Amino acid sequence: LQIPFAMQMAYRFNGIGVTQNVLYENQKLIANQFNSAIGKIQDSLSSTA
Amino acid sequence: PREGVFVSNGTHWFVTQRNFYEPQIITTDNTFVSGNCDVVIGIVNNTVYDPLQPELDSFK
Numbered sequence: 001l002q003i004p005f006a007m008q009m010a011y012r013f014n015g016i017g018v019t020q021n022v023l024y025e026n027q028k029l030i031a032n033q034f035n036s037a038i039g040k041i042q043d044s045l046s047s048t049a
Numbered sequence: 050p051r052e053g054v055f056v057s058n059g060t061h062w063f064v065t066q067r068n069f070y071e072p073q074i075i076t077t078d079n080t081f082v083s084g085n086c087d088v089v090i091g092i093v094n095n096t097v098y099d100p101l102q103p104e105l106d107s108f109k
């Protein structure tokens with residue numbers, strides 16, 4: 001069942017015990033943090049063997 | 050939404066539980082307020098019915 005990804009992340013925030021408004025008001029920051037974390041995963045894999 | 054998700058059939062808006070389509074009128078009881086309109090990406094305009102107002106309207 002399709003759902004907008006921001007809405008899914010709000011569902012997951014509810015799952016961990018945080019209200020949806022936190023995600024909907026910090027969406028830009030959360031997306032930037034996730035993207036930076038994925039980039040750091042890239043760097044860690046491409047450097048550490 | 051307190052619990053559930055906002056949906057629209059095309060003209061009107063409702064709040065329903067996520068796992069079963071049971072549309073309901075968006076009221077103050079079904080929802081909670083947080084902040085203003087300028088910070089949420091994808092917010093839409095719609096009236097939020099106040100269950101208390103018609104009771105006081107008959108009072109008036």
Ligand SMILES: *[C@@H]1O[C@H](CO)[C@@H](O[C@@H]2O[C@H](CO)[C@@H](O[C@@H]3O[C@H](CO)[C@@H](O)[C@H](O)[C@@H]3O)[C@H](O)[C@H]2NC(C)=O)[C@H](O)[C@H]1NC(C)=O
Pocket residue numbers: 029032033
């Ligand atoms: C809660 O935590 C986040 C960090 O995860 C804070 O966001 C960070 O806030 C600082 C200052 O606003 C940002 O630093 C700025 O970076 C820009 C980059 O162009 C730079 O020009 C500024 O001079 C400044 O150094 C930082 O980037 C930002 N981090 C992310 C991932 O966006 C947030 O401010 C904290 N909020 C509260 C209420 O504590």
Ligand SMILES: *[C@@H]1O[C@H](CO)[C@@H](O[C@@H]2O[C@H](CO)[C@@H](O[C@H]3O[C@H](CO)[C@@H](O)[C@H](O)[C@@H]3O)[C@H](O)[C@H]2NC(C)=O)[C@H](O)[C@H]1NC(C)=O
Pocket residue numbers: 058059060061
């Ligand atoms: C999306 O949901 C809306 C709520 O069900 C719906 O609006 C409703 O449409 C029906 C007509 O099909 C109305 O039903 C009433 O129709 C007459 C109008 O006076 C009454 O006499 C009847 O007894 C019956 O109650 C609803 O009143 C009307 N609800 C509202 C708030 O206007 C939309 O039609 C739905 N949109 C689509 C595309 O399906």
Ligand SMILES: *[C@@H]1O[C@H](CO)[C@@H](O[C@@H]2O[C@H](CO)[C@@H](O[C@H]3O[C@H](CO)[C@@H](O)[C@H](O)[C@@H]3O)[C@H](O)[C@H]2NC(C)=O)[C@H](O)[C@H]1NC(C)=O
Pocket residue numbers: 093094
């Ligand atoms: C959702 O509801 C909002 C409020 O009804 C509405 O924002 C309103 O948008 C109109 C025009 O887009 C603004 O009307 C005036 O805007 C400027 C002032 O900055 C004037 O120069 C114009 O001539 C016009 O008179 C309203 O000021 C503005 N209301 C608020 C509180 O900012 C949104 O457009 C609605 N969103 C959607 C998708 O319909």
Ligand SMILES: *[C@@H]1O[C@H](CO)[C@@H](O)[C@H](O)[C@H]1NC(C)=O
Pocket residue numbers: 090091
């Ligand atoms: C969703 O997609 C349409 C076009 O694909 C776009 O106009 C709209 O801005 C998008 N919604 C949001 C909240 O960005």
